[PDB]
From a paper:
Phosphoketolase (XPK) belongs to the transketolase family, a member of thiamine pyrophosphate (TPP)-dependent enzyme superfamily. It converts F6P, xylulose-5-phosphate (Xu5P) or sedoheptulose-7-phosphate (S7P), which are intermediates in RuBP regeneration, to produce acetyl phosphate (AcP) and C3, C4 or C5 sugar phosphates. XPK is an enzyme present in many microorganisms, primarily involved in substrate-level phosphorylation to produce AcP.
On the other hand, Bifidobacterium longum XPK showed no inhibition by ATP. Of note, while the dimer–dimer interface in the SeXPK dodecamer involves residues near the C terminus, the B. longum XPK octamer involves residues near the N terminus. As the donut-shape or four-leaf clover shape-like particles or two-dimensional (2D) class average images were not in perfect symmetry, we further examined whether the assigned symmetries were pseudosymmetry. Some relative random motions were observed between different dimers in both SeXPK dodecamer and B. longum octamer assemblies, suggesting the likelihood of pseudosymmetry in these structures. Comparison between the C-terminal interfaces of free SeXPK and free B. longum XPK structures provides a structural basis for the lack of ATP inhibition in B. longum XPK.
Residue numbers in the entry:
A (entry chain A), B (entry chain B): 2 to 807
Write the structure that this text describes.
């Protein structure tokens, strides 16, 4: 559960003290000095003479155009957290301002705790300076290695979705979400503005969006900064916000005059937020206007105004590095030396090199710190889900009526299971879906919870299962759902989210980024505890898009997921639910797991059930298993072909083809691969099937016919070094489809039962079976003409039931 | 060039006639009847008795929740185009309202022209009804097979970007962009609202956004419909629009009263647009507020109000199909019969079954029609680029100083070439980039054009190369850039767009969709003429992300591009520019091509040049070629290894390793693969290298060491059936990186020169070369410790120049 920390939502009821703002100004100066020492210096952190070009880095990498503004905001937020005792997580949208975050971690004392070799003295300062963006050092962005970070910020557009996710079901947590003005042009964040219509001020926390409007992107100005102030305020008010505006640094006003002004504006905003929270305890049915801060400052605000006669401060020329070579001229080194001395570090550091005590007296202590806040490290919060007994949801008719029974929909079983998980776990488990929960048949959870909706209600003929609080969030944006769930998991909670297969590509970037958060975490960051897994139910898949057609058919999610399987990280799982029982086993395993991205590919269509629960779990631990009840060959020597399958429709076609093969006396084996990554190379993947086990499943000399859900490229690229891999003949999706009957969909991809039987016959003896092969091939065309003439699939195809049903 | 059609931007200066609105109402009724006959009927289109359940489709697929609103808007737009003679292309954002578009194509006469077997009589109406969403029929969405369509609309969020792209450099074209209210929640379209700050009213056309606010998504209401009207107008005004609002169908007002009211509102909006256009001829430096229409209607507006006691009209229950089974009960069939008779088709069709003449008298004729407009079929507009002589831009120093000369940046050559293409082709070629044109070194085009920017200007110390008109558009959104370019090509123009490699994933969906527009076009749609290719310069690639690090390294674009290579469509090209000359040849070939997606992967870093222009073109036509100047073995028999490469950094490492191999007497071959898809299976890909050519390039028995830009999975999945494929040892990206020196980046991926030399030595004789292998392995660690100690890469690595430089 999310803990209550400090004294939440308290008003100051006093002026901001002068001593605190003294401390805030000194903090800002020292944070800018650290952020510059990191970029430029490799030695001599405190500029003991001789300070020469020997002390400067050979290759200057990093960013400065956002760092002083971030340091300003972070120092003021630190004063605020010390004063109010607020439970606060900062989300840094422009993550390229990494030196700001590392300077915070260093100054609040958490960096030395996490990394003991970076001491708080001259040698520790030298190591801290050298390690930024260095061989064998720390990254340039706001990284998982950086304490106090739940968001990398490298790939832009997801500060707001992550903020609204982090506050969900989390009522005491305050999140200032700093948003770059260039990042605000990206598609994800524009729609992430509208997510205050999906949170409740009573049951969820408060997100304060700080638009960091410094006017410029890389080498280009931002649209928001160059439209009129009337337009900007009108725009933010049309999205349910009260815009506040702060402008600074565009004239010669004294720094204290700026710190004081920001203190009054900040306390005004805090009082509006506290009023909203206090009102929500009585009335939470009508939405408030949350304050949001527009923070207009010059880009690179403390750097030299002009360098080489080019406007540097207040321009895009300060984005990455002013003084691109302070190492190769004497004039640029003098500019750099003057820039470092303009902060007066001589008074901010003591003799031994530690930041002076009066510079950090205004700082929060203990669990209130940014790097120490448990919501930033959501693995220490996390507790296991309390799971219902799986046998309660098993489809038992397979156990007595025989394999292949029924016309059930696989995802309804997961719906019931997830409903009871929600029942056992309220306020820790949440279901997201881009308008598609009821189309993936996960609506059984409406028996115990509602869709959280905080826009207007109009009627009850149209607004069923909607409520101002709920455990089902549903907005038509995959970016929103994925950012919500990722921030939900990163804070310590659990969740599933469902989607159409073809639109998972919309978040290929986001998944990639999350994998990079996991790949980095499992490799080099032990102090970050495991978080829950990102569970993605992929349904309404390529083979059954009757209503939509070719635009909704693209199973390429498997390929993008296969690219993140390296160095024994195991941060990826791709599971194929052949039926409801296998889906139960997969979902149980996935809900128990940690630090992974689990894509469970299950169909919503009426499909037969093949396994019992014990059989499903037994197939699960191996990933691939032989179906002894479907095989006609007792041992590996007898079979004239191995028929392997991965996916519900490929499984159905393999089984129907096996029925026809039985009538011709063909001895074959039947294999089902539930988990794709078990087929990976044994030396590469230590949790994949060993080579002996793989050869036992697939006969070394005998041909293997493989029917696969996605593109066959993904199977062939995975088994390349496996034994008997030359004989594998993968049949997968082949970018051929439309709106048409279900048999046609598999016909045009050469994955129907007739084509599979003909493929197996050709693997054995093309000459002996020539007449039967011809008969099958002309039957495919007759059965297509049947669907054209009559509008539905052939009775031979529709009515087929497996021979193993009693 | 974009043609001027009709009489653009003319005011009516008269009331809308009563006869025209009579026609508009009759059109709306007949369009609704056709849109229902398509979904529900397979026979008896005009309901001659006996009209029985025999006449209804077995499987009812399709959508209705948006179709009557679309028919309303389209009929009114048709009256408008007939009256004003406007050059108009409609972009249908909710593309699942396909029956509306097909009903338009049928009613304006273009459908019979394109498809002669769908006549305009009873049999033709029966075929038109049966073919919708049928085996062997037409798709459900607004498809390339549908005349008058440039946008599929299946995957949501790109109606607005496509509209603003279609009007760019196109001053007489009017685009009403119909936007679904659910689609408006998606991330892409939220930022596509802000694209009126990137178009000029003088040089570009006018986009009118029609928000089709029917209140509901699939099974969920929309955020925009449930916020206050004040908020909605404030929101649209903060984005530079004047909101107009129309509300209809929510009471018992007469249909004519609605058509009249809409006529008046539409002419008011048109007069504001015409005022904007006339003002722009004198003043185009200050941005106007373009009108946008908010079209509030009930979802499924003419369907039965209640079915099964559930609110159907004005609800989300009417999204796909009311009466999910009008075939399986008699009551539902009676509901359907009453629904069809409520339009009074008895007076809309004549005896022979044609739509009556007075129903379509108000319709536009000739080139003004939606299905006949040349901007919808942008292949008939298209003309070839006038290309500068390639030899003008060749890097000639390779020809005299020897291969491997220099430290040039490859993309600057493309910058100059593209600059001269822009010079020869203004107002037909355009450069897009998500804030990254100057970071990919394409800024040479600023010598002949400017960045188009129509927000505010503040200074000239920061606003260089910006102008209210230009051929370089640059917004920080990959969705925006890709939609702009796709609508630019679909209208008949040409373009390039550049991006970081890691963020191309942001548009994996969009590329997929465009490939589906091309796969469908090259297979079954001959009447659609070829459009220019989508040219994507992928730069700032994985191997040289010094400033950014792990968050900016993901070369997975190659994998998603490989999934669209089927059935000899050739709609995909993946090219690796090994140096500037190869880049010139690739870019020339790509600019000449049609109906393709060409990803050109080129580095912006200082890299050596290896080929002359003639050599580069000679490598180009084959895709892969042997470097005879780098090989030490004269024939295929002598070589003890083949070193193949694809990519500038892999090429550099192969060449440096070849230098070390030369010192040990190893006989080897050197191969460079410029085009990835030539390595594909010969039987699958008729334009790939034949099997004999492939075996000639790669020795059958000899091991092949392959250094590859992207993940090795993509190489292994492509050569699976090729000869000698067992001996291939692909070395690619392995998700291991950070901010560090360039040698470290290739060190941690086992793709550096030392590791490649050791790999080749192990392929030959591990025992004989054991000491040398050990020496190489410990040198890698020494050269990494050098970078850690000193901050830059080893002199042995940095200073290395190929031995072939004179
Ligand atoms: C989607 C995406 N496209 C491009 C980039 C490359 N990039 C890194 S930083 C940056 C500019 C930062 O813009 P803004 O939000 O205005 O930041 P600030 O002014 O704080 O530097 C860009 C385009 C990215 N990180 N993500
Ligand atoms: C990105 C994306 N996510 C999901 C879908 C699935 N989908 C198809 S139609 C639809 C609802 C249409 O919403 P809206 O724009 O409100 O349309 P309308 O009210 O006109 O039906 C959805 C979610 C999609 N096409 N694209
Ligand atoms: Mg900015
Ligand atoms: Mg809608």
């Amino acid at each position: 559960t999310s803990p209550v920390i400090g004294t939440p939502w308290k008003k100051l009821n006093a002026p901001v003290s002068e001593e605190a703002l003294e401390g805030v100004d000194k903090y800002w100066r020292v944070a800018n000095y650290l952020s510059i020492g990191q970029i430029y210096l490799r030695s001599n952190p405190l500029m003991k003479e001789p300070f020469t070009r020997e002390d400067v880095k050979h290759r200057l990498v990093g960013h400065w155009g956002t760092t002083p503004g971030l340091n300003f905001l972070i120092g003021h937020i630190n004063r605020f957290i010390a004063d109010h005792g607020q439970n606060t997580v900062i989300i840094m949208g422009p993550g390229h301002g990494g030196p700001a975050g590392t300077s915070q971690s260093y100054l609040d004392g958490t960096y030395t705790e996490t990394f003991p070799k970076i001491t708080k003295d001259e040698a520790g300062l030298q190591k801290f300076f050298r390690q930024f963006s260095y061989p064998g050092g720390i990254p340039s962005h706001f990284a998982p290695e950086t304490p106090g970070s739940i968001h990398e910020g490298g790939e832009l557009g997801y500060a707001l979705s992550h903020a609204y996710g982090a506050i969900m079901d989390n009522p005491s947590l305050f999140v200032p979400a700093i948003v770059g003005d260039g990042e605000a042009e990206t598609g994800p964040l524009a729609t992430g503005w509208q997510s205050n219509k999906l949170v409740n001020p009573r049951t969820d926390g408060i997100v304060l969006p700080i638009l960091h409007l410094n006017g410029y992107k890389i080498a280009n100005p931002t649209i928001l900064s160059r439209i009129s102030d009337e337009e900007l305020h009108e725009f933010f008010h049309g999205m349910g916000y009260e815009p506040y505006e702060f402008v600074a640094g565009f004239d010669d006003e004294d720094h204290m005059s700026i710190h004081r002004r920001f203190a009054e504006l900040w306390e005004t905003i805090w009082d509006e937020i506290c009023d909203i929270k206090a009102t929500a305890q009585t009335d939470n049915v009508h939405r408030p206007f949350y304050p949001m801060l527009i923070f207009r400052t010059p880009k690179g605000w403390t750097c030299p105004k002009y360098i080489d006669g080019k406007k540097t401060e207040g321009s895009w020329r300060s984005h990455q590095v002013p003084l691109a070579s302070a190492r190769d001229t004497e004039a640029h080194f003098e500019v750099l030396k003057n820039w470092l001395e303009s902060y007066k570090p001589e008074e901010l550091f003591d003799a031994n090199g530690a930041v002076k005590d009066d510079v950090l007296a205004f700082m929060p202590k203990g669990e209130l710190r940014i790097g120490a806040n448990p919501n930033a490290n959501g693995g220490v919060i996390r507790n296991d889900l309390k799971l219902p007994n799986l046998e309660d949801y098993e489809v038992k008719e397979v156990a007595e009526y025989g394999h292949g029974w029924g016309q059930l929909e696989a995802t309804r079983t997961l719906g019931a299971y997830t409903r009871d998980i929600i029942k056992n776990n309220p306020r820790d488990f949440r279901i997201f879906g881009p308008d598609e929960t009821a189309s993936n048949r996960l609506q059984a959870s409406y028996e115990v919870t509602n869709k959280q909706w905080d826009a207007g209600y109009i009627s009850d003929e149209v607004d069923e299962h909607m409520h101002v609080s709920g455990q089902v969030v549903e907005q038509l944006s995959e970016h929103q759902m994925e950012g919500f769930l990722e921030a939900y998991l990163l804070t310590g909670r659990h969740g599933i989210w469902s989607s159409y297969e073809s639109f998972v590509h919309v978040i290929d970037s986001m998944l990639n980024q999350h994998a990079k958060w996991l790949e980095a975490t499992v490799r080099e960051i032990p102090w970050r505890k495991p978080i829950a897994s990102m569970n993605l139910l992929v349904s309404s898949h390529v083979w059954r898009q009757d209503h939509n057609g070719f635009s909704h058919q693209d199973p390429g999610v498997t390929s993008v997921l296969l690219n993140k399987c390296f160095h024994n990280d195991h941060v990826i799982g791709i599971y194929f639910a052949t039926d409801a029982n296998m889906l139960l086993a997969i979902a149980e395993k996935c809900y128990k797991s940690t630090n992974k991205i689990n894509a469970i590919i299950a169909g919503k269509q009426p499909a037969a059930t093949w396994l019992t629960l014990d059989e499903a779990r037994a197939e699960l631990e191996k990933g691939a298993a032989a179906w002894d009840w479907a095989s006609t060959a007792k041992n590996n020597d007898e079979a004239e072909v191995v028929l392997a399958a991965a996916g519900d429709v490929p499984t159905q076609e393999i089984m129907a083809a096996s029925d026809k093969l039985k009538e011709l006396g063909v001895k074959f084996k039947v294999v089902n691969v539930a988990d794709l990554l078990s087929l990976q190379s044994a030396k590469e993947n230590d949790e994949a099937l060993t080579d002996e086990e793989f050869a036992d499943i697939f006969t070394a000399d005998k041909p293997v016919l493989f029917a696969y859900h996605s593109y066959a490229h993904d199977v062939r690229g995975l088994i390349y070094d496996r034994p008997n891999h030359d004989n594998f003949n993968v049949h997968g999706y082949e970018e051929e489809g439309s709106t048409t009957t279900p048999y046609d969909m598999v016909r045009v991809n050469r994955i129907d039962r007739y084509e599979l039987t003909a493929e197996a016959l050709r693997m054995i003896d093309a000459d002996k079976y020539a007449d039967k092969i011809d008969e099958l091939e002309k039957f495919r065309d007759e059965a297509f003409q049947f669907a054209v003439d009559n509008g539905y699939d052939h009775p031979d195809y529709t009515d087929w039931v497996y021979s193993g049903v009693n």
